[PDB]
Design a protein around this ligand. Sequence first.
Ligand SMILES: [Au+]
Ligand SMILES: [Cl-]
Ligand SMILES: [Cl-]
Ligand SMILES: [Cl-]
Ligand code: NA
Length: 129
Amino acid sequence: KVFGRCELAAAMKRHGLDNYRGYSLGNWVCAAKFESNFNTQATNRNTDGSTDYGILQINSRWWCNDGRTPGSRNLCNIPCSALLSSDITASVNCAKKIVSDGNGMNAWVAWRNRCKGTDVQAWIRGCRL
Ligand SMILES: [Au+]
Ligand SMILES: [Cl-]
Ligand SMILES: [Cl-]
Ligand SMILES: [Cl-]
Ligand code: NA
C-alpha cells in the first residue's frame, strides 16, 4: 500500500507515534517519505547482505528475521515480512523499540540526512489530525 501523506500521519498518530521519544509526528512522516516514499512494500538490500523492509525500512541486521542475514538478531521478534503489511502496526511497534535504542531517530540515516533540523511540521500541514 502506498499511503497518502495525511493518511499515514493519521495512522501513525493512532498507533501512538506522535511525540513518541519526543519526536513530533512530522519527523516520522518525513522519515517514511524518504525511507520508502510511503510504500509499505518497499524492500532494499544493504551491502552487508541485510535488507531493509517497509514504510520505515527496518533492517534485518538487528530487528526482524528474514532467514538470510547471517549472525543478525530479531529484536522486534517478528518476520521481516510482517513489516510489509498494509497495516502499519508491526512497523510502528518495532520503530518504537528502535528509536528507544539510544540514538533516537538517527538510527534512520535518511532521517538524519534529510529530515533532522528541517521544518518537519510541513509534512503534516493541512492534515486533519
Ligand atoms: Au495502522
Ligand atoms: Cl537470518
Ligand atoms: Cl494502517
Ligand atoms: Cl532523542
Ligand atoms: Na535478523
